[PDB]
């Protein structure tokens, strides 16, 4: 055998196969790590940018409206619903069986005031904004897939699995509501 | 000892698991050692080594 490039092991010597797996496993560690790093860098570059995450916290104030209408207000990219309900409205909203609801919750829990109903106005199904004064329950209707919300914002018909989310809020004296 | 050393050489699934584990642990150990020596080489220059850190006025 030519020995300019490689010198043989003495005849009658056991194979170096098991030594060679160990040297090779060594560099395969690094190859796998490099693949993982590059792929994860590419994937995480699509995650939210530092400036996007910067604008993710703030609160605003509000005023007042007529007894029976709603006005949408603004946040991050998300509307917020306000609806001061009447006495017969509360009677309607306090006569629904909790068991029959797919998300059992009473109106009293959701509201911090007997008549002022404040709730994030984004459909829990796929993100559309539910149209007010529409539906089969006098609450809201989401046009996108037919999700019906009652006056308290509880889902009653459609694909949506949750009721409209109540955010943290409070009053100041009578007409200044902090969300 | 011999059990794992016989599984790694005889079944490629075990060898691939061994490669994945080695990548994980080796990359963490180098990240750790590289940060230790970085900390040793930059004593006093850290954000939390600032004496007045916390009193702007």
């Amino acid at each position: 055998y030519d020995d300019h490039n490689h010198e043989r092991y003495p005849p009658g010597d056991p194979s170096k196969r098991a030594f060679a797996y160990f040297v090779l496993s060594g560099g395969r560690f690094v190859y796998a790590s490099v693949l993982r790093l590059l792929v994860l860098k590419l994937i995480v570059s699509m995650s939210a940018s530092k400036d996007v995450l910067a604008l993710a916290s703030l609160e605003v104030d509000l005023g007042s409206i007529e007894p029976g209408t709603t006005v949408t207000v603004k946040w991050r990219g998300k509307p917020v619903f306000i609806r001061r309900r009447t006495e017969d409205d509360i009677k309607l909203a306090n006569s629904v069986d909790v068991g029959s609801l797919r998300d059992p919750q009473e109106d009293s829990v959701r509201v911090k005031n007997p008549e002022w109903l404040v709730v994030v106005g984004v459909c829990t199904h796929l993100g559309c904004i539910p149209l007010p004064n529409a539906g089969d329950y006098g609450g809201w209707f989401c046009p996108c897939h037919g999700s019906h919300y009652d006056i308290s914002g509880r889902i009653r018909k459609g694909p949506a699995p949750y009721n409209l989310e109540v955010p943290t809020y409070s009053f100041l004296e009578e007409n200044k509501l902090l969300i | 000892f011999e059990g794992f050393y016989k599984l790694i050489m005889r079944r490629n699934s075990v060898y691939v698991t061994f490669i994945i584990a080695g990548a994980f642990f080796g990359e963490r150990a180098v990240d750790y050692g590289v940060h230790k020596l970085w900390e040793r080489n930059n004593v006093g220059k850290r954000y939390e080594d600032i004496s007045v850190l916390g009193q702007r006025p």
Partner: peptide, 28 residues
Amino acid sequence: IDIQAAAGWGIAAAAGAIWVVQPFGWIK
């Protein structure tokens, strides 16, 4: 060679999932 191989490759896949995605904190 069929059930043992399936178990081994499932173990390898689970380990690779734990290695690529590292949710150390999702053990809750």
